[PDB]
Design a protein around this ligand. Sequence first.
Ligand SMILES: [Mg+2]
Lengths: 552, 52, 1340, 50, 50
Amino acid sequence: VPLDGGRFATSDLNDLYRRVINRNNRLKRLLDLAAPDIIVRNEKRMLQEAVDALLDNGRRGRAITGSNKRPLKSLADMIKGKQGRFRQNLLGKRVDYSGRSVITVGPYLRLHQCGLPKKMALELFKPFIYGKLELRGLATTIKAAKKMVEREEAVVWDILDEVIREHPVLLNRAPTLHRLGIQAFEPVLIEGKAIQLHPLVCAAYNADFDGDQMAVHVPLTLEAQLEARALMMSTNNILSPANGEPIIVPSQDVVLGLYYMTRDCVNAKGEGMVLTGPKEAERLYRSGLASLHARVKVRITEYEKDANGELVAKTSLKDTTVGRAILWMIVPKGLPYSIVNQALGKKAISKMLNTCYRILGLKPTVIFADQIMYTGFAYAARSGASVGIDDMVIPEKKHEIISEAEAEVAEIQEQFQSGLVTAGERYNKVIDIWAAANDRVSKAMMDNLQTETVINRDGQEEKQVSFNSIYMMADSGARGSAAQIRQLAGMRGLMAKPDGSIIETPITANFREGLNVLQYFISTHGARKGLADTALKTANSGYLTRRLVDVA
Amino acid sequence: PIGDDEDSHLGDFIEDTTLELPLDSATTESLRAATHDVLAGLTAREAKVLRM
Amino acid sequence: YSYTEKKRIRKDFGKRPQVLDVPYLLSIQLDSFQKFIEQDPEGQYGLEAAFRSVFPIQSYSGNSELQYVSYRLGEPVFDVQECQIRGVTYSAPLRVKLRLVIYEREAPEGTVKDIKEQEVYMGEIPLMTDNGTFVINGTERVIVSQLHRSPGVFFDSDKGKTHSSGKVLYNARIIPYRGSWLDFEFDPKDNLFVRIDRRRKLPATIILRALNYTTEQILDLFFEKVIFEIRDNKLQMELVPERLRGETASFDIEANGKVYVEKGRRITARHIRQLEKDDVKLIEVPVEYIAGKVVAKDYIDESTGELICAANMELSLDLLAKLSQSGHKRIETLFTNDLDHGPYISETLRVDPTNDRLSALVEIYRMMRPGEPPTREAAESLFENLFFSEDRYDLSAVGRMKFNRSLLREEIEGSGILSKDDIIDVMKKLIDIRNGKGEVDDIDHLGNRRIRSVGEMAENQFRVGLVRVERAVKERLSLGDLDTLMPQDMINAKPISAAVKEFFGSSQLSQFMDQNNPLSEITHKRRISALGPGGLTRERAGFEVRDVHPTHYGRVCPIETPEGPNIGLINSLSVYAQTNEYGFLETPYRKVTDGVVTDEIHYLSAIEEGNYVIAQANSNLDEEGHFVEDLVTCRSKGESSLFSRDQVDYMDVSTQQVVSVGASLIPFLEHDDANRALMGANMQRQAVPTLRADKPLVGTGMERAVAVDSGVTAVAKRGGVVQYVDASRIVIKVNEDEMYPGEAGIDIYNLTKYTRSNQNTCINQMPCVSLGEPVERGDVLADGPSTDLGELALGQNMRVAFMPWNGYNFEDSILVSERVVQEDRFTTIHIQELACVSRDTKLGPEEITADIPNVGEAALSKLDESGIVYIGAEVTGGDILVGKVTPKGETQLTPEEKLLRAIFGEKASDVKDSSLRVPNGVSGTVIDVQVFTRDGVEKDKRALEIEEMQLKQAKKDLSEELQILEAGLFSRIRAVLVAGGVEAEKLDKLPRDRWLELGLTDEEKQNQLEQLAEQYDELKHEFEKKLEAKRRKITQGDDLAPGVLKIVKVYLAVKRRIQPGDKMAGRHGNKGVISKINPIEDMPYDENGTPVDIVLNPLGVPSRMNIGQILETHLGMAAKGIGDKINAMLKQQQEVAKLREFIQRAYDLGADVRQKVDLSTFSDEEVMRLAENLRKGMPIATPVFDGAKEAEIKELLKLGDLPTSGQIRLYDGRTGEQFERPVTVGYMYMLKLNHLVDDKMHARSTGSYSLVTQQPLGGKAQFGGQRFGEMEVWALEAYGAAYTLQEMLTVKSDDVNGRTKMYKNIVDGNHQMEPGMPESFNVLLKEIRSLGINIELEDE
Amino acid sequence: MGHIELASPTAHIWFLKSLPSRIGLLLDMPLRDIERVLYFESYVVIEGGM
Amino acid sequence: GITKASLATESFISAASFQETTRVLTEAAVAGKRDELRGLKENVIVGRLI
Ligand SMILES: [Mg+2]
């Protein structure tokens, strides 16, 4: 076919059939002229090579093309492989009525709906807009409808809001491993150019918002709309197919807002006062008379399913906090009060959603997950939970333990220069005493973080769990655990060289202190090995998924 | 191959110019409908001659 | 300090006195290409090396020989700006003086009949620009330096993996620089083997038999001889006592009266030393010990000549009785052992089939070109042309150096080809490695890694061109006539220029310069790739090449590599590292004496590093150079250990030598994890240049080297007084002492205005100096993109609060106030280049007329009378820039359309609108229009208008060049005439023509007048001839593609601001997408009332272990606190003594530092401009691993009025009530990465379709389609969705009827699909059916 | 679709060079001898009597 | 195993869509094998309901 410029693109099959036709005509011409036997045996071998290069090139000396060193592409090259018709154009096709843009948060959504830009919604839904405009008579013909949606007149946006209203789109992130990678939503139109994606859904996608971009597809026909609503709407998939655990688990800001909201310090405003219910708990917190967390007797009324699907009510004075009572308005009718009477980390809130689904069905769990996300973001904003440089307390017992270990390695050094030990038992003793020093540093820094807040009420003193920022961000299960908190406050581990052997001189400096050049240079190897392993394990996990689905 | 040696070869970029756009098919359908409605409005001989 | 150094002096922490400053950061490129193209008088690397190597060309013994004289490069026809406009290579011709001789009859030493010596053209080679950039086809390209295995000899192990026996093998390898390889390897049973390639395993000793060696001297070279003498009886054994080490004897060895060695006892070395002291030479053994020995040489009978035993045969008692009767009492046996001397060569001889030289050559010639029968002289010429010919095999000087070094030779020079001693010594060394002594090597070690560069690779491709042409010259000179030609008809310049243009135009090592940041240029030029030709690939290699070896310290940056498919194969060259003479890496160290660290520095390579022991940069020493302890941390051989005070050999130079220039501009890099530091330094390239430049408050002090020593800013070459400042040009009056005597003049620097960078950003230069200002030599005058005052300003510094704010910062998201977007402080400028070609079809030629069928006049009001858009009309998506129509015919109209035409009589026109249009959804201004036209075609009106515009611009600009240059020259003439014959008031009345011819005393002053006069007249004539040359370059035609009439290029300048969906990033690797752009009313604000601009998320900081962004945030708050205190003291009009006091206290501030300052500056004029430059915030340098600690940040915050803890209480913008737990606010320097959202967003209703399979082709702005690949089809199978999948891969994608049926049904408002069959499955049926395989579909 | 009348016949590479070779174990003949026949290096009897 | 129980299948398009293709098409071409579309791989291939 002609490219622009008078120069053509041929497929290499034209070369192959040209070579086969050429040598066939040559062999007919030779058998006309009664050639000697060496020549026709040469020509029959050549015709064998030409046909065998046409059917599957690569099982011979790889007959290359003209004006190029690159080997050409035969028929079995077009069937077989990553670029064959079986895997590039039959099992997966590029599809119209699709779009692609950068994703972002937008926490003001219920989870049956996602944001979608006006410009993408105009470009995707063009034939729908054409149909409604020629139905409503604003465009006499369809070319007028083209020019009306081209000029973007003010009448088409009401039309587009009519064609969106109950029409689910499909959102898709590119590593679509498990079946929650394609989910439907109902679009809310956005002044902007970025798809707003509901936050609780993102843990299903393995989508962080660090620049990853997603794709929307549009169910055209009516059965596909009903499939995307009945089977693939986001409110249907709140349980994983891998296990019965919730996949719409609240992820990071919301669990921090909860863990700040439901806790108790021994002295706060309104300590030990009495409250008639959750409503004046909210009136006390939002007026500023009583604090968010202070232990308080309240009166709450919990319902239960004691009889056959019947909501038996019991009311009592529970001894709780203020913030727990404020969260109690959001719990539906069926659940007992003991689901909000603890500290509510990430495990506890997953158990909360699991019990709400296994009791009240689907609808209160969906609207309950939306209300949890809203109140988590709101009281995380009211928390002001902020990391800082004073938030990482270094133990006073750090350098003392490091000096003791530095004397003990000198002891083992003198015991090896005295010829008393061999090399391997020396090595094992030194690595055991550095691991012992690291464990003492860990048990020093944990007791210097978690109970460091000591304050007073109607007496001398009392200790409690700490309101350190990084301790809340590690205890809530929002981000990271005590391994990374250990690598920020105490010494970081014992690094391993490219042998897989492990160095006798560990990194006795955290990140709050500086690292000098040699320690950081040793740490770089572990970082680069980690990155290379994540890439290679991604590839092998893809291959394992493909074999497992194609066997089953 | 175009650059970076991906599965992107030159063949995946060549557009088809022998198809007709589907909007032109929509115009042709609506034009046949409109002309049929207009030729219904004529007489018998005029519509028959103009179709023939 | 210099003049801009005291303009805004940066506060600098850090405790190590820098003794070697940062070198010229582009030295690899420029020094390599200076080695390439330079007249070297010797066989030094360059073009001279390639010519003197491949020449003389001689005929096929026809006594006609072509030899070499010299070369020369002409000046380019086109300067760099016109070259980027037009599209040619920025190249230079290559003139070569060649000399042809022909000899006479029976006189090989005799006189030639004639010589023919002339110049000849052989291709154009591209020149490097002043910055390290080549221009090949309109674009500006960089050749990345390559890393590969050094040519030489490598002794690898390849442990374990062969046949799972637990045994290690050993393989030696000779890797040439150009030729065939060589391998030696063992097998699981102790037999040596040779490989001439990766071809079949051949027995080893045959290559010894290929070098004219019999079994005798092979066993002589590889073994020592044990002599059995029969001293009158009993077959005794001569003894050296060292031979008995570690052994066990089968009998009693007795020497001089006493039985020392007992039967069945292992021999202790006490016995050996007693035998040494007892003067023991020859002892008595039984006849049974010779049962295991092997004879050395051939033993025969003398008279009869019959063979007693041939060489390499074990000795039984029968052979002993045969050698007793012939009379020979001398027996030569081979000394063997299981540990010391292994009998490997004897076993290899017993495996080997051949015996003599000829069968060895026959075996090699049969085993390299198999299937054909051999021939003696062809085999001799083959084995000549494998390893011993000067043509097809070559080790360079580097090859011979490593080949002598790893064999522990003495000389470091030698021939390129091998020799017998070379191969035999490699085999000896391999047998010694197998015998337990010596060590293997490792390929990750940077002493066995050579770094290539641009000059070497261009030289090698040039040598490819020269051998490809010398084949033709040998063909011609074999048929060479006597006198019919000057010696240029023999040579074709198509292959030479073809090879060098093929290398610079198409390779994996030659790529488009990333040019959106000065850092990105200066780190793409400093890149060490391991890919490309002659190197490993991503599929084949490999893990140890990806990993970091301990010899990368100070040579290759470990924390900068592109995370992705190729990790570690795309390494970056460290800051202080240079390239050795032999090509290896070498790094600076400070020489240490007895105890005193001397400021002299020695560059050490990798294999020279391991001998010494090297101290730490982070050490502490007094003024006398003594270390403060008695023990210091060091590294000896890849091992960090604490050594003594005076055992050290070298100190590290500075704290920064382990990282690159990309990573060293991350402050507090010692406080981040290496993962996020890798990501931060990986993304610090990708900042778009913002509309201003805004001075990173937390810098590292490496910013000025990257700013100056890149190519974007304009560095002054000769200092002086600034005469003239304009946005277009800066005109410098040079001082008297820095001025040459001849060619007096003044300097002029033409700035580059708004123009197109390769990544569509706008590279621009702006003057930073004012009128009448003193400048130093080497001082910045014009800031480039992303540069302020000669610093590097990649992005802008903004007030940051780390708090979760209503979930809008959920995963990693950033949330920005409207105070940023109202200030346009992230509004960037992009330049796109839209093009409209106008070809000649075979239906007719295309036109650029303004008349377009079926458009409105309002759509064409933005066009001229010529049909090409005006300069400076803001267009949107869909406007017509170049009205172009293509002729068409043969409409093939339908029914009722033909009825309609008949009814209304409207002619279906003979033409089609194929005009150039703006892409879907951008805006901006048309700033530059070019019209390229083939010569011989009528130029339209706007083409002549652009030609008249450029002609007047060039003539006005060159007249301004000559006028201001001679204004400086006449101002020098007036300074000459005042000394020695002044006319104070008389001179300025009489004209400028009568200054050159006024009389004056004969001195150096009259000679000076003669010089200035002839320079005036020469510049006049040079002006005239170069104006005529510039006019003939502009007015002439332009080369185009074959069969295109004219090209109209239109440059849009889009001004893209910011919107939710963009990406921003600090320098620590905290990515984020802007999510909501709030008004100022909703931001958190502190008690002073200043609204924070960006609210990040704190939850990323414990998880991702980059704690240094918090420290950078606190120190940014400190910097802007000092800036606000200075702004308050300037707004109150405090006197300059108070400002001097406060700036003095701000610059003293801390531990022992490296930052002595004023009072030496001027009273007002330097201090007040410094305070004017510090009112936006006093900057802080933090040298990378050595800089500011926490306590200095606390003591700097105490200078401000800020709290020590660095956390202010903040008030919510909406509820107006205080946040509990006061939050961290500060000033983080953040960057706008060029993953903007409007380049990423598109959608498709229905567009084009691919030809061979009827599917919508993917891409942008080809309207693409999000590929619903194989895993997504599995996902829809995993649901119950089946109608979705049926329309997802039949109707929406593939079916040629189904998509149009669907479009009709949709515009009728009837949601329904008629599925049919996919088209690509029908293609699959035709492809299998077009094999011999019948595939069908069946009955019902 | 089209066709080409091949003058001399030609072995199909898929039934000759895949690892479970079909002409190979259909005639019960080793593959190197079959390629030796097809490249005109040798002969083979075709039901040549007894 | 999963790479061998997936190709030993009574339906050759599911045995030819991912793994070694040439051996599967020749093994099913000498056998005259008939594929009854049987199980979602062929129905994604042939473009009908699942
Ligand atoms: Mg991501």
